[PDB]
Amino acid sequence: MDPNTVSSFQVDCFLWHVRKRLADQELGDAPFLDRLRRDQKSLRGRGNTLGLDIETATRAGKQIVERILEEE
Amino acid sequence: DPNTVSSFQVDCFLWHVRKRLADQELGDAPFLDRLRRDQKSLRGRGNTLGLDIETATRAGKQIVERILEEE
């Protein structure tokens, strides 16, 4: 198991949450919302393959992305 | 649509976040493929909208920090 595959999934799960937050705030346009729906299905598939819970991976992704954001 | 501008700004910033992670050697091959393909799409979107990516990226940072401010 490539450790980068796990980190990539965790990051993608958190970035999905960020985008969902944009949608919740009614700031996503129609194509943005379609990417959001389609990517959710994609992440579900990836999580299944990896044996990783999406919510758990999202939290892990948050910690990874938080360290990028704090250095911005 | 103003949401088209906001969506582009957020997408630019999130691409930058993904690039940062790739720079940190955290990306696998599909992650890197997506980063590279998406850079081309964002450049296309920037042309369609007449918006500079650098500027939209900074605006995106502000939107993201604002929508995550309570988290």
UniProtKB/TrEMBL annotation, chain B:
One of its GO terms (biological process) is symbiont-mediated suppression of host cytoplasmic pattern recognition receptor signaling pathway via inhibition of RIG-I activity. The keyword RNA-binding applies. It is found in: Host nucleus; Host cytoplasm. GO terms for molecular function: protein serine/threonine kinase inhibitor activity; RNA binding. One of its GO terms (cellular component) is host cell nucleus. Keywords: Eukaryotic host gene expression shutoff by virus, Host cytoplasm, Host gene expression shutoff by virus, Host mRNA suppression by virus, Host nucleus, Host-virus interaction, Inhibition of host innate immune response by virus, Inhibition of host interferon signaling pathway by virus, Inhibition of host PKR by virus, Inhibition of host pre-mRNA processing by virus, Inhibition of host RIG-I by virus, Inhibition of host RLR pathway by virus, Interferon antiviral system evasion, RNA-binding, Viral immunoevasion. Signal peptide: none annotated. Its main location: host cell. The dsRNA-binding region is required for suppression of RNA silencing. Inhibits post-transcriptional processing of cellular pre-mRNA, by binding and inhibiting two cellular proteins that are required for the 3'-end processing of cellular pre-mRNAs: the 30 kDa cleavage and polyadenylation specificity factor/CPSF4 and the poly(A)-binding protein 2/PABPN1. In turn, unprocessed 3' end pre-mRNAs accumulate in the host nucleus and are no longer exported to the cytoplasm. Cellular protein synthesis is thereby shut off very early after virus infection. Homodimer. Interacts with host TRIM25 (via coiled coil); this interaction specifically inhibits TRIM25 multimerization and TRIM25-mediated RIGI CARD ubiquitination. Interacts with human EIF2AK2/PKR, CPSF4, IVNS1ABP and PABPN1. Belongs to the influenza A viruses NS1 family. This is Non-structural protein 1. It comes from Influenza A virus (A/crow/Kyoto/53/2004(H5N1)). The chain holds residues 2 to 72 of 225 of the full protein.
